Amino acid sequence: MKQIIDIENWERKENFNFFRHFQNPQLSITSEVECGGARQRAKAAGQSFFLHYLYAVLRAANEIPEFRYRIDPDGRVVLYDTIDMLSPIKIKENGKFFTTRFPYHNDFDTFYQEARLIIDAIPEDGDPYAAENEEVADGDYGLILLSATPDLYFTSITGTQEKRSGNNYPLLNAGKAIIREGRLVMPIAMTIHHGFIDGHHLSLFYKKVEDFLK
Amino acid sequence: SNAMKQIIDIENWERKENFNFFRHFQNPQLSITSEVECGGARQRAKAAGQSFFLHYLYAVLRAANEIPEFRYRIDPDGRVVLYDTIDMLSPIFFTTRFPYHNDFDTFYQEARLIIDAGDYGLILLSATPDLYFTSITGTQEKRSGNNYPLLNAGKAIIREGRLVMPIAMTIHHGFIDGHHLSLFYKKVEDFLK
Amino acid sequence: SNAMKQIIDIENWERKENFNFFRHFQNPQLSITSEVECGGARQRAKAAGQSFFLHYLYAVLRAANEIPEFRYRIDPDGRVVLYDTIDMLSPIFFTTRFPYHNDFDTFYQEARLIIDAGDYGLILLSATPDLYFTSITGTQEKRSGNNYPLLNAGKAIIREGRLVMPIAMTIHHGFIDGHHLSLFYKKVEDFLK
């Protein structure tokens, strides 16, 4: 569910046309967020800390409309009503993962419990990229994707680039939560299309994620 | 144009091989992010009732002017050119141009007046004063790379007791090695710390 | 040849769908930077009058050798090859080859002698020990990516009482996931202490 954007109106007409013919219209950024609050809440509730920051990220993307803009399969700029989550869930100790979809819910408890059921249902073996190729086959780009590396603190991860117009959707990476000057912080990297998102929206995204994580 | 500039004699150019190495790369650019101490400049700008932004804008612009490698470009015909002097573009958003002056106070004065209102002899810095980051990697317009360096400045932050800010840049690797990057950041920090 | 190497049977390979996902991409590579503690190695190198450079160079080469994913290459004909063993290139600039040995002291000895003087079974590390950085993203030679992993080592710096240093790298996502990157950095840090 989405709107075809009237390019002639739309405040980013000129921003988007600037990057239209770029070899690489994407930018990657890594920043750090405090997350001590969500870690305490997760520990106390006996819950997955992963789902707490997954929610934080998914909610910020939904709440800042610039993060809902996509170049659809037919090459048209569209704005999705709602953005869901793809994430590569590790299934084996040698790194095997299976990518799967998590629906956004505005109520954390609802999101949390649907998330948990999805993870419990994850197949023992599987095609690591089936879920992504399904969304591409469907033409559903109303998604973001986050990959966790909970045992690695990084200062930079850049994204891959599928095609000239850029990836179909935003790609994110979460890293290890670590005490820095007495506060728990974790790194989050992302790759976005610069036609849709400037520094200013990235600032609000990270501010927003950190607010949820506390 | 109407810019000072020199067409480079490739055959007597000290970076002939360095540049030729990269010439058919799909992506000949590197991105680097580092951070610089900036407490001295924060304090000087506070004392003078001045824009902190223009202090670090100038620090960056001066460093690039003092390291020749930061002033090499590929003109519209694909020829290597050296610019004697480099000005600053910055989205204030409206992208505005700031001429370089050897003299901070002159630079500052002219920049304030400008704000109140194939030339590749430029760098562009984009500021996001509310966003700290450990990395930004920039766009790439065309195969041969962007027309000029693209920089990003982020939030000044107290890290182990010292005010530091991140500066990312994307440059063409044929012009610039790790040695020049190191001199660049060192010069920006010397002006700011 | 005469390398111990294997032409991978993609249809029966555990990474078939991983590799096939990335292999047609405009950019199938990813860049990562992370910091590793290295106080122990700095100390041990000091105590033994050794090159510290060679300690971390070794830690990196050893980590890549021990994780098979870091040894997969795309040969000149576009075929996936797995090298049993991998050596090190490093600009010393003379880009010089350092053969891997399982034993550190042996590697050290040979490396010191070497300095005093379509093969993709290699990684290349470029050290800039006076350059502090939080991020470097590398270049890309062709659509299919670089021929082998490119790395950058930066300045050793104290963070909250621990000596740490940044190591950046560019890899093919067809061969290497976050899981393997996490293991790579863990092994490097385990050696450097």
Q: What single string gives the DSSP state of each residue in B84-104?
A: S--EEEEE---EEEE---SSH
Taking Cα atoms as reference points, which of C33, C141, C124, C117 lies closest to residue C86? C124
Experimental technique, in short, is: X-ray
In whole angstroms, give the CA distance from residue A129 to residue A134.
Answer: 9
| Residues facing C164 on adjacent strands | C37, C157
Q: A19-35 burial by CB neighbour count: b if 16+ within 10 A, else e?
A: beebbbbbbbbbbbbbb
Quote the CA–CA distance of A27 and B136 in Å, as a whole number: 7
Cβ neighbours of residue A111 closer than 8 Å, sequence gap 6 or more: A51, A55, A58, A102, A103, A104, A105
- Cis omega before residue C2 (within 30°)? yes
Find the largest Cα–Cα distance for chain C. Answer: 51
Residue bearing tokens 């860049």: C31
Helix/strand/coil (H/E/C) assignment for every residue in A105-174: CCCHHHHHHHHHHHHHHCCCCCCCCHHHHHHHHHCCCCEEEEEECCCCCCCEECCCECCCCCCCCCEEEE
Phi, psi of A133 (to 5 degrees): -75, -25
First to last CA, chain A: 32
What residues form DSSP beta bridges with B170? B31, B150
C-alpha–C-alpha distance, residues B39 and B51, integer Å:
14
3-class SS of residue C15: coil
What separation in angstroms does the CA of C55 have from each of A167, C122, C127?
39, 18, 12
- Give backbone dihedrals phi and psi of C29, rounded to 5 degrees, phi first: -95, 160
Handedness of CA C61, C63, C65, C69 (dihedral sign): negative
- The three-class DSSP label of residue B180 is helix
Contact (CB<8Å) B130/A207:
yes
Q: At what angle do helices C178-192 and C39-47 cross, to 10 degrees?
A: 40
CA-based max dimension of chain B: 51
Cis preceding linkage at B152, omega within 30: no
Q: Which residue out of B25, B131, B158 would a mutagenesis test of the A interface target, given it has the greatest number of A Cβ atoms within 10 Å?
A: B131
First-to-last CA distance in chain B? 35
Whole-angstrom distance, CA of residue A92 vs CA of residue A86: 18
The pair of structure tokens assigned to A88 is 């590569």
Say yes or no: C51 contacts chain B, CB-CB below 8 A.
no
Closest chain C C-alpha to B36 CA, distance in angstroms: 10
Gap between the Cα atoms of B115 and B112, Å rounded: 5
Residue A9, min C-alpha distance to chain C (Å): 31
Indicate the helix (H) or strand (E) that contains B65. helix B52-66
Instruction: Give the distance from residue C49's alpha carbon to the nearest chain A alpha carbon, in angstroms.
Output: 32
Cα–Cα dist B4/B46, whole Å: 36
- For chain C, breaks with the C atom over 2.5 A from the next N come after 92, 117
List, in order of start, the domains of chain C with CATH numbers: 1-193 (3.30.559.10)
CA distance C187 to C69: 14
Rounded Cα–Cα distance for residues A59 and A85 (Å) = 10
- Helix/strand/coil for A204: helix
Residue at A194: amino acid letter: H
- Scan for tokens 């046309």, then name that residue: A17
List CB contacts (< 8 A) between A23 and chain B: 27, 140-143
Amino acid at B21: F
Give dist(CA A83, CA B10) in Å, integer.
52
Q: What span, in angstroms and rounded, lies between the C-alpha atoms of C56 and C165?
A: 10
Euclidean distance between CA atoms A168 and A196, whole angstroms: 13
Query: Cα separation of A18 and A28, whole Å?
Result: 18
- Give dist(CA A112, CA A108) in Å, integer: 6
- The number of helix segments (H) and strand segments (E) in chain A equals 6, 11
Q: Would you tell me how many other CB atoms lie within 10 Å of the CB of residue B118? A: 12
Collect all residues with Cβ–Cβ distance below 8 Å to C186 and sequence separation of at least 6: A151, A152
- B136 reaches A (C-beta below 8 A): yes
Sign, CA torsion A174/A190/A108/A200: positive
Nearest to C54 by CA among C20, C11, C88: C88
Tokens of B68: 């020749």
Contacts of A172 in chain B (CB under 8 A): none
Largest CA distance in chain A: 51
Distance separating alpha carbons of residues A176 and C181, to the nearest angstrom: 13
Return d(Cα B82, Cα B70) in angstroms, integer: 9
Inter-chain touch A24–B128, beta carbons under 8 Å: no
- Residue A20: DSSP 8-state: T
